[PDB]
Structures are given as C-alpha cells and as structure tokens.
C-alpha cells in the first residue's frame, strides 16, 4: 500500500537498498550493489551520485550537464542482472545486465557488461562491453 520498493528490483525498500548507498550512509559492498545504485540514480535523476560513483580518472564533474541532459530523454523501465564477478586480488569486478527503457515513446533495452574498479575501499564505475 505505502511501500516504496527499490527501483533496482530487489523487492526491498529503497531506504534499505540502494537508498542508503546513494545517501552516503553505506558503502557499496560489491559491484552489483553499485550497479543497482547507479541505476536508481539514473531513475531518480541524482547525477551528483552518478559523478561520485564514477572512477576519478574519468572527470565526471566535467560532464555533469550532459548527465542531466540525458535524464530528459529516457524513461527507465527495469533492471535485470544476469552475471556478476569480482575479486579482491584484482580490485576489479563485472556486472552484466539488461536495462529496459523507453525513448520517444519507443521501447528498447540495453544489454551490457560493465566493469568496476576498487579504490580505497570503494567501488567505481569505469567501462563497459557488449557481451
């Protein structure tokens, strides 16, 4: 009735899922959590988080405006993760996902395997490859 299920699809309340991470209250334990959290930020148009979650070498602040601009063109309709891998030895991780959306009234889906890198206890997004 008054539930606020997380936009990531976890069946958990946002406050207790991706929301505590985007709030800064909780560090993302793994690449999957970060991916989910970034998806929620896209859905909730945060951008500041999307920049904080972007690997520092990418200089995200510089393209903040383009992130905002992107918010207006797409409507997110769902996230489905089908693969996840990570290791402390590599400080690297991967998340394969399908993100469905709508653009100009036309539906579509993204299928990508994103890479995440860890720096000082925190995971950051960096790159991607179409699996």
């Amino acid at each position: 009735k008054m539930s606020q299920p997380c936009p990531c699809g976890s069946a958990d309340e946002y406050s207790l899922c991706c929301g505590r991470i985007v709030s800064g209250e909780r560090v993302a334990p793994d690449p999957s959590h970060l991916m989910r959290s970034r998806y929620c930020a896209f859905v909730m148009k945060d951008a500041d988080y999307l920049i904080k979650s972007w690997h520092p070498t990418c200089n995200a602040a510089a393209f903040r405006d383009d992130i905002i601009a992107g918010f207006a063109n797409t409507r997110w309709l769902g996230l489905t993760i089908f693969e996840h891998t990570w290791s402390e030895a590599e400080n690297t991780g991967y998340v394969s996902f399908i993100a469905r959306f709508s653009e100009q009234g036309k539906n579509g889906a993204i299928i990508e395997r994103s890479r995440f890198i860890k720096e000082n206890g925190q995971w950051y997004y960096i790159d991607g490859t179409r699996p």
């Binding site: 489905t80 089908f82 394969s96 399908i98 889906a109 299928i111």
Partner: peptide
Amino acid sequence: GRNDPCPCGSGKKFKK
C-alpha cells in the same frame, strides 16, 4: 544470437 535464451528470462528470444 537474439534467439538464444533471452537473459530476461522470457524463455525464448530477446525479441520476445
């Protein structure tokens, strides 16, 4: 390719 089990779980194609 597209017809291999769509990881969406639809059971057949990414098209479908």
